[PDB]
Amino acid sequence: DEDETTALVCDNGSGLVKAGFAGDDAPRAVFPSIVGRPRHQGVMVGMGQKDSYVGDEAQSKRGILTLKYPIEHGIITNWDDMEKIWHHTFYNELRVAPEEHPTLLTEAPLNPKANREKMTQIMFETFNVPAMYVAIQAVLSLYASGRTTGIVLDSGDGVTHNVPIYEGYALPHAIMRLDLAGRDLTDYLMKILTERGYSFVTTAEREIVRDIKEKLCYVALDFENEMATAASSSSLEKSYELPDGQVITIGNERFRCPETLFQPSFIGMESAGIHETTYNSIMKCDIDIRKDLYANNVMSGGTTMYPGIADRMQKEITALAPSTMKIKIIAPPERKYSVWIGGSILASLSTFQQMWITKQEYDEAGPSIVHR
Amino acid sequence: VTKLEKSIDDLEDELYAQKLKYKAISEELDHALNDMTSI
Amino acid sequence: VTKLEKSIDDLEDELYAQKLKYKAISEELDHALNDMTSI
Amino acid sequence: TDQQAEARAFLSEEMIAEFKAAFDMFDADGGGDISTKELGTVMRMLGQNPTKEELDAIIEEVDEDGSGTIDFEEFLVMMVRQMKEDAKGKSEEELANCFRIFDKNADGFIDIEELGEILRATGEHVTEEDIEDLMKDSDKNNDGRIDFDEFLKMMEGVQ
Amino acid sequence: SYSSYLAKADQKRGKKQTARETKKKVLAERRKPLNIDHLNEDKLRDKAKELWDWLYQLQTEKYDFAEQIKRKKYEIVTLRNRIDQAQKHS
Amino acid sequence: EEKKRRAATARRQHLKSAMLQLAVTEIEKEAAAKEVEKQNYLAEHSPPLSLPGSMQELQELSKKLHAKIDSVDEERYDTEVKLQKTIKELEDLSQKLFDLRGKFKRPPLRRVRMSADAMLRALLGSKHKVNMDLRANLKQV
């Protein structure tokens, strides 16, 4: 129990932090990855002067603060502001003292060696956690779907990745990163919806375009004869009621937004798209492992939640793969937390105890120890 | 042998068709049991 | 032929097992889609 | 150091006295702290066979000064946590056992009937009112029975 | 749900067959032939009992493993009641 | 204003302790009795051996035993495995409760290291006089 209860799992994202206790089924804490700094001197009624704001209080009060994102494209870019988000996570969100809890953290696919050593330096030397561990994100997603070999298409708020994993070892030279994700996708909907003849003028109009994207957006299979369908004008249309009455209608654009993930050309991106990239990762891997990867395309991440994403991907890679092959696109329902759940499982596991980096290992080996 | 090999390939193919037609309804399922536990 | 006949009987049997394991999850399904449309 | 406080606050001179004698034998050279090696020797004398990883973890559990060694203070802390855990385990074990004795019908519960029996089984003099009263006070989920959880709670304190 | 039937066969048969040989491998090791046959006469005496003890050895353990499961089986019954009691979907 | 109510509670305690006190003394009864059953069971399944004559008997008996050994051993094995299965079943249940409550009392597996009382005895042998449990110590008279 000492640490059975006690292991923490913190998944640091570009848009959201997911956090909680190893053992739980889902994150106890989910909140924006921002750190707000007040543009002016003054106070809220009853509070003192605050130097900084994190998560939702930074989002809610955004009009008087300069908002900053510590993690650009999955990589920690500002370490002063990240230690601020961690502090908030332990002390306010989970309300635990960190110096008696083992902490499993996550990093990104080709996270620079030096960063994995730096967050270890900050975990052990400024938070004084007993022990910690850094798992790679795609690797926890895979594992949370039971398996050990497969290829994960991972897509969240600032990055998309393909991480081919074989008997647990993520394959460095076959990993692909596509910098277009849910953030890019909300801003494109924004324009095709203002372009539908609308105005997201106040900040209460801006924010909810993102809630339109999440609730009403679709990834149609045969996106071709779906536009064609749009035109005959079926009961395909969908009206959402705004903060007030102002019933906005979205028929068609509803799927023009996730067609951006297959066609980056919709947004002036010259890069290849999700399905081709799944494939290219795969023809960059060893030959003998390619049947395995093909029957185990695990999807994880908030942006892979658009319904019919899996069917489109299913047919997208069947028709690029040699017919002798078995294609299989696994997309679980909890996928917006796969990464986290994979960490919860792993860290609560009976056999993981012997991989925890302890302060004994650290004080004796330097940050190098956990770096592997 | 060619007769039985021809019947093994039809059953093994009718197969990945069944095994897959499901990953879809069992996954449409963890989903369609999660949103009513939430709503 | 004896090898392929042995592999056809294992796939055809793995089969009625899959085809049946489903009627159950697809039926648990019309059910587990109807109560959230109701709640 | 804050821990080393209550820790020494917890123990008695007697305790410290012996925990010292014990600490001294841990410490070979007699310098002032158990090393990752000095510990290994005693562990084996104690009948274990830890690995480098295992040893350190056991060390840096009470190494507040990031020394990589254990001083008679960090040690007392360690003894304390143990003293604690030991006593806790022994307690829950005993109660656990008591529940099985009181259960006997093995339904995993203790119904007002058995409660009466066991109670009446004590020397003490009791009338039904007492029995049903103790039931009503113990049964928090008001289901009639007394689950292990409730039993732990109800016996919480009692000796 | 009948496409999962082929899963039953593969799965069950698989695991069960895996378990078998293991048991065979394991049990085989702990077995040293009765090689000593007609090498001495009083040998049987000092031998027979040794076998006897080994038997008694195993017997006694089997009895303990047994009583153990029973105790565990009860731990379960209780651990299940704590699970239901701790349900309260409230 | 329920001034007397205080005595009611003390009773439950007095009784609770009358219960536990009862428990403990019954606990060792069942324990020893249990053992008795164990020696009787063994009493017949493998009674005080009596080495036979000399020729065919010793050999025969030996063969008899040796075969039974593989027998009992197999049974011993099957049993060990049903235990494994069981311990497994409760570990999972010992989970379905954790992430539904948290750390709860009396986990079935119990990871225990040796007690400090043990280590102390082990290391000082004779001079280890402290029935440590919890009782703090504050100046007597």
Swiss-Prot record, chains B, C:
The modification Phosphotyrosine is found at Y16. The chain holds residues 246 to 284 of 284 of the full protein. Belongs to the tropomyosin family. The molecule is in a coiled coil structure that is formed by 2 polypeptide chains. The sequence exhibits a prominent seven-residues periodicity. The modification Phosphoserine is found at S7, S26, S38. It is found in: Cytoplasm, Cytoskeleton. It comes from the Eukaryota. The lineage of its organism: Eukaryota, Metazoa, Chordata, Craniata, Vertebrata. This is Tropomyosin alpha-1 chain. It comes from Oryctolagus cuniculus (Rabbit).
Swiss-Prot record, chain D:
Residues 14-49, 50-85, 90-125, 126-159 form the EF-hand domain. It comes from the Eukaryota. GO terms for molecular function: calcium ion binding. Keywords: Calcium, Metal-binding, Muscle protein, Repeat. It holds the Pfam family EF-hand_7. Ca(2+) 3 binds at D103, N105, D107, E114. Gene3D superfamilies: EF-hand. Ca(2+) 2 binds at D63, D65, S67, T69, E74. InterPro entries: CALM/Myosin/TropC-like, EF-hand-dom_pair, EF_Hand_1_Ca_BS, EF_hand_dom. Ca(2+) 4 binds at D139, N141, D143, R145, E150. Changing T127I: Decreases calcium affinity. The keyword Thylakoid does not apply. SMART domains: EFh. GO terms for biological process: skeletal muscle contraction. Ca(2+) 1 binds at D27, D29, D33, E38. The keyword Metal-binding applies. One of its GO terms (cellular component) is troponin complex. Skeletal muscle troponin C binds four calcium ions. Belongs to the troponin C family. PANTHER family: MYOSIN LIGHT CHAIN 1, 3 (PTHR23048), TROPONIN C2, FAST SKELETAL TYPE (PTHR23048:SF57). Troponin is the central regulatory protein of striated muscle contraction. Tn consists of three components: Tn-I which is the inhibitor of actomyosin ATPase, Tn-T which contains the binding site for tropomyosin and Tn-C. The binding of calcium to Tn-C abolishes the inhibitory action of Tn on actin filaments. This is Troponin C, skeletal muscle. It comes from Gallus gallus.
From Swiss-Prot, chain E:
It comes from the Eukaryota. Residues 18-29 have a biased composition (Basic and acidic residues). Troponin T is the tropomyosin-binding subunit of troponin, the thin filament regulatory complex which confers calcium-sensitivity to striated muscle actomyosin ATPase activity. Belongs to the troponin T family. This is Troponin T, fast skeletal muscle isoforms. The gene is TNNT3. The chain holds residues 160 to 249 of 263 of the full protein.
From Swiss-Prot, chain F:
The lineage of its organism: Eukaryota, Metazoa, Chordata, Craniata, Vertebrata. The N-terminus is blocked. One of its GO terms (biological process) is skeletal muscle contraction. Binds to actin and tropomyosin. This is Troponin I, fast skeletal muscle. GO terms for molecular function: actin binding. It comes from the Eukaryota. Troponin I is the inhibitory subunit of troponin, the thin filament regulatory complex which confers calcium-sensitivity to striated muscle actomyosin ATPase activity. Residues 94-114 are annotated as: Involved in binding TNC and actin. Keywords: Acetylation, Actin-binding, Muscle protein. The chain holds residues 4 to 144 of 183 of the full protein. Residues 1-45 are annotated as: Involved in binding TNC. Belongs to the troponin I family. GO terms for cellular component: troponin complex.
